[model samples]
Target chain A: PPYTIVYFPVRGRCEAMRMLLADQGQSWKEEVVTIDTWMQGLLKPTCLYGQLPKFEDGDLTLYQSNAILRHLGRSLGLYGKNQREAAQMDMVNDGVEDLRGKYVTLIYTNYENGKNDYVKALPGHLKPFETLLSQNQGGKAFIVGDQISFADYNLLDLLLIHQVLAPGCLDNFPLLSAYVARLSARPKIKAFLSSPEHVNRPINGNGKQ
Target chain B: PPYTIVYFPVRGRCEAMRMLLADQGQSWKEEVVTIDTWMQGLLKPTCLYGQLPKFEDGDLTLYQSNAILRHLGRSLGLYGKNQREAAQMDMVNDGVEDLRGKYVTLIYTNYENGKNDYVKALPGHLKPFETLLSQNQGGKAFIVGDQISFADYNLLDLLLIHQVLAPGCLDNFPLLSAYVARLSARPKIKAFLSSPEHVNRPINGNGKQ
Candidate 1:
């Protein structure tokens, strides 16, 4: 195996990594931590940050999902072609993180009370991504430039999860909607999404994306 | 100035840059958007992601705090000396971000109702950083390698603001406490912290660190 990703038995932060690997045609293994394992013992206590989605490659064992994504991005040449585009990829990825942060907060903490407000604020958040698309080839191309960077995978997963969380969330942003459809249609990614491996797995611990 | 940081008049996301510049003996200007200015329209709307901490260097414009930090880091040679160290730096940074994500949410969104539990659960969060320090020069050096990466600045700011939010939060972690003090005592950064400029600025919009 090229590397192994150790995570809980859900997508959560690891989804982007999976998508990136699939899209970039790389190989990695998933060593899942079941709910029983999580609650039954000291495994999590022994974890460096007491968090899942740790990545081990060669002699290095790394935590932090964003770091793992960027590492793969750099190693796999999925970081953009230039310094400028690389920075843009970082910018776009961080933006995706911001939205994902709020989304996760809602899912795990405030969904019942915050759902309506979150839905109301959805467009303000989604519009920026759409605008970024429009700036590049009039929304016909990738998020940053002509090529697909690692952040695109994260952003694509974000869009996918958002659609699951908020039905028709992308409906208002035609560019984003089309972008989602197009990226999800990528052959390897399309296969991954349709497979029982992906289909049977919950997007998150509590079945919320 | 070679660079200008445009953000609201708060330390929320911009403090890391301030610390980085202060410690690096670099100078830059702040373009502040006060609440009144933000409400006056167009300024906030003109922002790329409708968020603050927009960085402008010469003719280039950028958003997202982490991206700006990494860009400046790359340009200024604050990234580590090699690829492996760079990955370590990114790992440290992403970890800081993960912790900061939870910290900010507590301060802004869940302050009143969730303060107690947050404070209780915080040790689990801070322990990882302390452990990271322990791994490198026994908590006496920077977060990643021996050098001060841009993420070090972010982590420093994180520690400072955390001490503000939770008094004696670092008391239990001697390494982190000393690390904060060590980073804060650098000549230029020390001067910057003791100056009226930094003292007068609130860490966040409503004074919740």
Candidate 2:
């Protein structure tokens, strides 16, 4: 395989890229790093940032999840068609990342106590994405442009996990609810979502969501 | 001005983009927002992410800092030569962002209690960038490619603030220390760094760094 992903067993950070590869009908190798193996600390020093979800494309090795997504985006032609569109993609992707950070904090650091407050404030975090969807092609297209960019895969993964975290969270936002259904119904994505590999894996390492 | 930066008085997230514009010798307008003005909540609803460091390029408005850098990167021809180089740039920028997040948490949330441990673990965080610099052009060039990308400016700002937070932090990393010196010596960057507009602003919203 030209692409190899080295990450933990959990979906965690690598799921977005995995979904991207699956939706693109691309095949890759997975090098699952068990927690016990990581505890040995042998591979830690080799990582550029000392974290998991290390990815390799042929001879080029890359770290960082968003970097892997952007790499796959460029290689698979999922980046936007023009500079301006790509910038818009960057904006939406960054916004997605911000909300993802807050979600991670809720899941790992303060899950027992923070879940209620997090769910309460979820709409404020989610509304920006809904508004973003509405502004572009009247919410009929992908997040940034008509064509699916890397940000779409990332945002889709986020929405999927948010649904798991807070059921019916998208109910209030019509465009976002429609967008999630639309992206989920794509042939490759539908197949990938139903696969055992995705269904069996935990959404996070801590097993909160 | 074709570019306008709306941010708080602190350098915070906007300094890197400001540094990029200065290094490129591109002029932009600064729409400094005081805390009092922000407290009024008039512009908060208009911001996409409800955060400062709002950037405008003609009619296009962007809220995220990295997105702004990328927009400027693309528009100013400072991204990278090719797809591979751009991916490498994204990797470096994302790694920079991870460290920046830790830095922000330390400054805003745990500065009084966590600074000591943060400084202790500082070398581990800083080494990756040094290793990245060493691998390319014998540590003589920018972070990613032969030409400077937006990541370089972001990394430079992070390094600058790190020095303020933990003085002599880069003493052991010769490549990073030298890289900082070389980037700061650029006529435009040097001038911008010394200007009252840059010098007068605090590095963070809080007085921690």
- Largest DockQ belongs to which candidate? 2
* Candidate 1 residue spans exceeding 4 A from truth: A110-116, B110-117
* TM-score values for chain B across all models: 0.96, 0.98
Per-chain TM-score of candidate 1, chain B: 0.96
Docking quality category of candidate 1 according to DockQ thresholds: medium
Give the alpha-carbon lDDT of every model.
0.86, 0.91
Q: What is the interface RMSD of each candidate, in Å?
A: 1.1, 0.9
Candidate 2 runs further than 4 Å off:
none
> Per-residue lDDT for A124 in model 2?
94
Full-model lDDT, candidate 1: 0.86
How accurate is chain B of model 2, given as a TM-score from 0 to 1? 0.98
